[PDB]
Design a protein around this ligand. Structure first.
Ligand SMILES: [Mg+2]
Ligand SMILES: [Mg+2]
Ligand SMILES: [Mg+2]
Ligand SMILES: [Mg+2]
Ligand SMILES: [Mg+2]
Ligand SMILES: [Mg+2]
Ligand SMILES: [Mg+2]
Ligand SMILES: [Mg+2]
Ligand SMILES: [Mg+2]
Ligand SMILES: [Mg+2]
Lengths: 383, 383, 383, 383, 383
């Protein structure tokens, strides 16, 4: 049968500030999706957070872009906001619920969505990712690596089915344009684009042999835009092994975001604090020093008949402690830089804050004229 | 509504020696504040320790310096002392209950108090800190950093509302005098003072734009004086982000105190051993090698209608493990110094111990006369 | 009132081999001492292990060397051996129950005993230690440090009462002789002796000012002898602070024992796996690589009216993780040495194994004669 | 007397590629400035390189912007290019000699110039810096720190003369505008600007008390622009101590440039390979892995009567080996990022390379239309 | 024969600022002492620097406090100052030549002097030390360790002649008083004093068995006072082995001084840059980051008939690279503390700078009155 796997993510209230979610937020969303399950709306679900973003992972048969699945997620976010965030006066309550109405589609309303509709396989392992304190371009490098880099994904070299490579669907979020690029041949051009992570964002990957969908990352054209993305990746059987996918994250590369959406720091692959598959909830890591560093969590599932068996915390292994130690140490090195590029983002990712405003001052003197005048201009200031 | 958030801290019995508190101490204080809640005395509370100091965090509407809130905390400390510390023959039972009477105000009676009365905000995240085995000047540097250092608090550079800086209320605990200093312009003078952490202690910080209170640190003029302080900081929304506040502690600077209140060692930001928000108790870290090193704990809350939602252990993140590893290693390096300045405090912080006494011996010879006499003075000793 | 605090330790069954104890061993010993408590035999107790040695900590009023307390401990070891070790066919079941009869005193029968009888103080914090896979001389250095080294115990320099130093009771286990030495003046001679840890063993320390007992280490003259010792130390109030005592262990010095009682490795200060003060049991660390490394555990209590409030795991602090990391790394360095001095003990601690036997071969040639004969002696071997 | 100290820097030939200079380049420039000295054109000189940029440090009395000093440096660069770079077919021979004519002033012709004209002091220590493989904004942070950061320059807090702070002359290289900012009060605005290191570049610093010049960094408005800058800083006596200046560089912050002027990596403070004050030449470090990492060198002098006594390699101290080890390790971490932001510069510093060209392809599909067409667009590619 | 070994040290000109000496300074002092040798004034000499302090080590037979030896050193410092420091306009030229006249004795005129007059032994190894950027109390800990600590000097435990310990001559530089203390018995009191390194300074050590002199450290009562000390230690043969002396320095303890004589940092044991025993000169390390860290150098000699055979750089061994790496890393950790105690010295070592001056402002409000007035006092500032 054709299942649709759908992640719909939103920040609706931080506890405290931007550090974590409140757990009743999770409890209430799980309780609500359990009604929709009972009512036949969805087959299975799982509810978790990373930092302060709630992810609603849902299986169902209404396909992509569906207004009842997108509706259900909207409704269920609205209700956490009114019943809990507003109740507890949580920080940035209702943050991502930017638009107010609700046409039919949730995209470009504030929450993030990655979905894939495929025919379920004999075995169907998927990984589900969520990052906090970063932007969707943060997965551009793990995505490139796992589907295109031979040093990460051995399957590219030694598995016949992957040998032909993958199709990359790249969204230009600035000018609302899509590029289809196909590895290996187009690797250097793909990189030419996606390496500018603020603007060219891998939205979907497709297997080239049969067209099968492989991954969908959460990204929309600017206006909303995109904070803290969520990713869905399908694994094994002519698609990256689960561990080739996990390897793509073994190096905590630097991502944009961190504190005030204006700095860069290492992407730490974190453990969940607890995973309760019976109650269908997982509590992810907190964000602490400087509001991060930025973090990604990974839960793996096996789907059967649309049911979600899992999830398993896939960054839970001593091997990832080394990675975590590295990221802690880089977060520390890079922070000693204070408010300077490249620790601080370029002015354009600044432009959305309010550095510009300030510059309502100073009085700038044009250079050619100040150059024959330096001495009295300083003489002024000095007295 | 105007809430008052009030921390009132005391060491009333160590278990064993100076290492920790007994847990029934916490249990009994929580049970007691729950009566006062029921009776309408206070809106909410939370009871925790770091090392051997019990903190009673209480919300209420009686404002600062109130004799019923200060009374309640006194009463509730007295009762732990008689019912438990004295019962179990705990070490330094009733330690901080120095005075005996109880005029109206608790300050200068032994326990430490930081309170703030503000109009509650749309979202109102506060952080609550407690350090053990140090002195109130230990927060002078984290306080300076989070409100005045651009390398710590990006908000100073990129958030319009903080751009104008803060007012620092500095108490001269030695001569009972207060200095108001305002950053940025007065930074170098603020530092001139507060860098002498034994004497010029940041007691309160105020936002300069509107006068809003931002932080209150626990400090009183000498006589009592001040051990193991507690700090209250309000975050977000024109005030340091929660993570800019947590960053101010990312470097385990050296603080005075540690063993016998006479040495200096790194301030380790520690995790709580357990946080039970349902029973309103948290058990902090123990103090071990050399009676520390010194440690600070951080709990974050969101206030609604005076209710304390929390607390969240905000030093609970792999990023702070690096910091903790650093502090462990410095505690080890610096200790190899034994009883020597600067590992050992200057003589004046010694003067309150009993190095002076000793020096009831030796016989000191005046120099000018010993200089023509060295040879027979040694000839003596030798025989 | 005068309490006696009494630790009586024995290895009666390893699970598996020499790695740990079986937990019913602990359960059964706790159940048994609870009868004796009920019957008035003893005031309080606590039952724990480190590696494969069971420690019975008991409070009571029968004073030192008492035959009912020593009897109770014997009886209760015999019963674990018959009811559990023998039942489960545990390794080296009944190991330390060497003698067979039972005159009146347990010392020189196999188990280890440290006791102190003192008048209980206003506050009376004691620490209770147990090491596995080493010998009683392993505490010679922590003992020296905490009572005699100014770099460890600041109290020696800055506390008037300790300024006069301590009396060291040193047992020569080889020739059954006792030396009384008193620090500071006799430091160099104390060291001359105790630095030979296999033979001159600090058995007791006494405060010099008033004669008060301070510490008692578990040691008996050879025949039995002594494996895996237990130590009792009283803290605070003119005696080392609890943290000066814990500092004496902050450096994992090398001790004799480890694997087959014939090697040297670092003394790792370990955490307990669990501490249950309600059931009066604690499960200590396992011994793994090469049967260690060697380890010591520390539980602190506060005594009131002979009741044992505790115990607290006093090596449970991030600061001791650094120490633990160091010890892991030295255990690794030193092991690459294989069977060579000094990783391997001197021949005399070998002499109690069976290196000697072997040397029933080779044929040794006397040197003076072999020297004019080398060439044909090799010519032989070669053909 | 009023001396002018003048550094005029140029890349005129790499050996090999971009790694170093050829030593006859240095030899020939020294030989040439020795004529000009003999002829009275200049008082003293010193000739050194870092990476592949030659620095001509010259003392003289013709003041700033002088056409004979700028001429002499031009002439002497032209002659190295024709007599050596072109001779040996060195890489990028004559690179920085962009313009062809020579009006009167060297600025905006390709080479970099920092000069200061001051009255020589009783003692007059200056430091002279040169960086390779970076851009002039690389010194924005060391410059800010040494004149404005109290954590770097203790003199700001404890020296009366510096207490009043400094004037920062900031050039907007993009719109040819100058900003005068004065610390402390304007710190946050200074940072608002200079933290965008690609565009707002500290060109000069002046002491605020008397107007004295303190530092001049090498920077010109875009067209030329600016690679690998050179800095001149005066030290001591109401101006940063020599070591407060050296401290500003103790943390290898990330700078733009490195390989192909398109990446960011740590600024390594390097030693010179040799310093020959008798022949007035110093050979700086090579640039190796990935064409760096980027590096800065420091030579200190004492001026007397315009004579340059020195120079001393001021990064030659074990303390800077730690810094160097850190930078090596970051260069290694950050490089594993390949062609991705922030390791790779933002598109705008790309725009001067030729990423744009490429994008002569792919065919971009507008999003709104591709969204109802995905399936056949992939069906295409797949077949 | 009775030789006198005499070190007389002075800072007379830094190159640049405070980083090093100019080498002609050394050359000229060596040339000058070679005349005095030729003339019979002195038997042998050696001339070296550490940081910016020149040491004149001289052997001779005029005994301690001699006016011709002290004169010769004065004269020879004056001449370097006029002929070189003043010539080259070096920084702080003539710095230590504070007084102007010259009664007979050099002590309390600015330079530092350590001398010992002993009967030369069958073999007579001495070590000669010089530290820069610290104060004479910096050797208090190495001095204590090598003569009194059994963990440093094994000879105390295992060599019969040292078993009786040493006499410590302690100068109270604040009240011009001398204390004779004798180890072991007086260890704790010695420490009580010398651990306050700013005031109780070990000036001389004497062997207790025969009265022999062992060490003399450079220290005078305040007025002058004391910067950057020099130490002379005699080794072997009932006195610490050369390596027990070198061990006393194996841990880079924190010392007062560093930058602006107002901070604390690790004492790095450094190598000499070059040792030329034929020309009788050695060039020591430079001081760089933050004007240090502080450093000590060690040259060993063998005396025969007063001739100085040597010197050997005794910190030149890979084993000391570990120590040097540690010190680099601590210098880095502790510096992140900026202007705060204990990185910054206590106010009293401040009092000699000019923190006090500043505090000509702010207006301090007395506390009791400000406490009922806070709100309008902030209302003021805010408007
Ligand atoms: Mg948020
Ligand atoms: Mg978020
Ligand atoms: Mg206490
Ligand atoms: Mg306390
Ligand atoms: Mg066993
Ligand atoms: Mg055992
Ligand atoms: Mg080039
Ligand atoms: Mg270049
Ligand atoms: Mg100097
Ligand atoms: Mg000096």
């Amino acid at each position: 049968m054709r299942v649709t796997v759908s992640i719909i993510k939103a920040d609706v209230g931080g506890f405290p500030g931007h550090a974590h979610v409140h757990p009743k937020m999770l409890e209430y969303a799980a309780a609500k999706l359990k009604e929709a399950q009972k009512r036949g709306v969805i087959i299975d679900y799982f509810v978790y957070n990373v930092g302060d973003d709630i992810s609603l992972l849902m299986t169902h048969t209404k396909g992509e872009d569906n207004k009842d699945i997108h509706g259900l997620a909207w409704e269920t976010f609205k209700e956490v906001t009114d019943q809990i965030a507003k109740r507890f006066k949580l920080y940035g309550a209702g943050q991502d619920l930017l638009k107010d109405a609700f046409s039919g589609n949730i995209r470009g309303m504030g929450p993030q969505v990655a979905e894939m509709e495929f025919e379920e396989r004999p075995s169907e392992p998927i990984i589900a990712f969520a990052a906090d304190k970063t932007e969707p371009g943060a997965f551009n490098l793990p995505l490139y690596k796992m589907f295109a880099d031979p040093f990460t994904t051995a399957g590219l070299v030694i598995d016949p089915s992957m040998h032909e490579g993958f199709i990359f669907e790249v969204l230009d979020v600035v000018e609302h344009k899509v590029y289809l690029l196909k590895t290996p041949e187009d690797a250097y051009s793909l990189l030419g684009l996606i390496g500018t992570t603020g603007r060219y964002i891998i939205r979907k990957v497709f297997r080239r042999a049969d067209g099968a969908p492989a991954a969908a990352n959460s990204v929309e054209r600017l206006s909303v835009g995109k904070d803290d993305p969520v990713l869905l990746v399908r694994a094994q059987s002519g698609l990256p092994a689960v561990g080739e996918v996990l390897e793509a994250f073994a190096h905590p590369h630097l991502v944009h975001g961190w504190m005030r959406g204006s700095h860069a720091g290492p992407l730490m692959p974190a453990r969940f604090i607890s995973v309760d598959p019976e109650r269908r909830i997982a509590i992810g890591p907190k964000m602490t020093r400087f509001d991060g560093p930025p973090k990604v969590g990974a839960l793996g599932f096996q789907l059967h008949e649309g049911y979600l068996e899992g999830g398993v915390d896939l960054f839970d292994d001593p091997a990832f402690d080394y990675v975590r130690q590295t990221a802690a140490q880089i977060a520390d090195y890079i922070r000693r830089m204070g408010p300077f590029q490249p620790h601080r983002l370029p002015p354009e990712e600044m432009e959305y804050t309010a550095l510009p405003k300030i510059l309502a001052k100073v009085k700038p003197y044009p250079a050619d004229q100040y150059e024959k005048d330096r001495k009295k201009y300083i003489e002024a200031v000095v007295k």
